[PDB]
Design an enzyme around this catalytic site. Sequence first.
Site, short mmCIF file in Angstrom:
data_model
loop_
_atom_site.label_atom_id
_atom_site.label_comp_id
_atom_site.label_asym_id
_atom_site.label_seq_id
_atom_site.Cartn_x
_atom_site.Cartn_y
_atom_site.Cartn_z
N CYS A 80 -23.17 -11.29 4.99
CA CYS A 80 -22.46 -11.91 3.87
C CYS A 80 -22.22 -10.84 2.79
CB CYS A 80 -23.23 -13.12 3.32
SG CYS A 80 -23.22 -14.57 4.42
N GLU A 104 -19.63 -10.21 9.94
CA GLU A 104 -19.99 -11.40 10.69
C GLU A 104 -18.84 -12.41 10.62
OE1 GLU A 104 -22.75 -15.23 10.19
OE2 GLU A 104 -23.96 -13.41 9.94
#
Lengths: 273, 28
Positions: free
Chosen positions: A139, A173
Amino acid sequence: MIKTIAFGRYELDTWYHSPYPEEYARLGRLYMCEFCLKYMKSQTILRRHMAKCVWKHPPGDEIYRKGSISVFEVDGKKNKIYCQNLCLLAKLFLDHKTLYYDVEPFLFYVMTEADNTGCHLIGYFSKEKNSFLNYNVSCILTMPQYMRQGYGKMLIDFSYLLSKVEEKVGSPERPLSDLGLISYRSYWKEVLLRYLHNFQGKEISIKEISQETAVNPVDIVSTLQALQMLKYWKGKHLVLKRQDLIDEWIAKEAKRSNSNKTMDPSCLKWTPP
Amino acid sequence: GMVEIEIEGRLHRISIFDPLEIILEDDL
Ligand SMILES: [Zn+2]
């Protein structure tokens, strides 16, 4: 429910919902210790804390400093509390963020700008300690008061710089937030136009580029097509060096790097596992 | 390594190890 946070000299509207304890989620305003990231019920409470609090920057190791701008590498296991707070903080402003409780299997890279009071939180990215899929970013967030200033790019750029020094290719991701798909798309264009500018040869493989920049070969093919530089004539695949984009890239280089929003491999002091 | 996607209403597949030729303007 929560609507604003006092974060240092700033007062920020919060964008989403964060699984703060309902004791606090019952409140419409939270007061955050800008250095240790403790959350508190009131202004009077915070102030007393700030008089006790010792942090003038995050924990971990400062693996990059270039003047005021630093980046600290915080181990989720070594500072479980600091990293958990960080997630809650990031969960406002970040729509699809999964993890809050179990920060142990993760490294957090925290970018900070220093002034006379301390090193203030710009933004961060988290990175799995052992990504099965070789993700170099889990993140990533720029704090609102630092958005639209070219720090996002600096964060992304730092994530790949790690990858380089780790001698790895990686990728963020999946999925990619709607806001972050544009910046990676942008960053992969900076990166690719630069390479083609410096590359003087007559041919190249993606794997070569993938290895030079640390960008995943799929993200490379992707961008080449986005830029419409992947052409197919007479039975093969050619890279089409567009003068325009390359020429626009050089003018855009002047602009950006006049304002020092560039990361600098010479300032990194890091060793990978 | 073999990627797949589209170029002007056709469908195309490309290896990430073959050297690809870089060109400028020219007859095509
Ligand atoms: Zn504190």
